[PDB]
Amino acid sequence: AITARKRRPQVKLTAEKLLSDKGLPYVLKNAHKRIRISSKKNSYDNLSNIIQFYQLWAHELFPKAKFKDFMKICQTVGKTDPVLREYRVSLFRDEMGM
């Protein structure tokens, strides 16, 4: 019966999006393929070989945030969300189930 009034929306990294296909399943699809670590390279380069993939994945998943801030958000949702816990424990449960 009433004409609308606008209110500002907001978006944040929900655990559902973190569990979308481009979320952690993307990590499982691509991390072991893309990160490579070797004695043939120094420690700084090996650390960079990790960080480059996780940064690109983080930006492609949630481009809004800086990489460190994204990491804090990920650590904190990891500290809290039950479905994310069930997923992570399911990963190590699958490794147990091998």
Give the residues lining the site for other proteins (CB under 8 A): 9-11, 62-64
Burial of 2 (0-12, 13-18, 19+ CB in 10 A): exposed
Our CB check for other proteins shows the closer of 63 and 97 to be 63
CA gap 57, 26 in Å, rounded: 8
Q: For the chain, how far is it from start to end, CA to CA, in angstroms?
A: 59
Spatial contact of 30 and 57, defined as CB atoms under 8 Å apart: yes
CB of 41 to DNA, least distance (A): 36
Under the binding rule (CB under 7 A), the answer on residue 10 touching DNA is yes
Per CB under 7 A, the segment of 7-15, 19-27, 44-52, 62-70 that binds DNA is 7-15
Spatial separation of the C-alpha atoms in residues 94 and 86, rounded to whole Å = 12
With CB under 5 to 8 Å by kind, the binding choice for 64 among other proteins, DNA, none is: other proteins
Say how many residues touch DNA, by CB under 7 A: 9
What residues make contact with DNA under the rule CB under 7 A? 6-8, 10, 12, 76, 79-80, 82
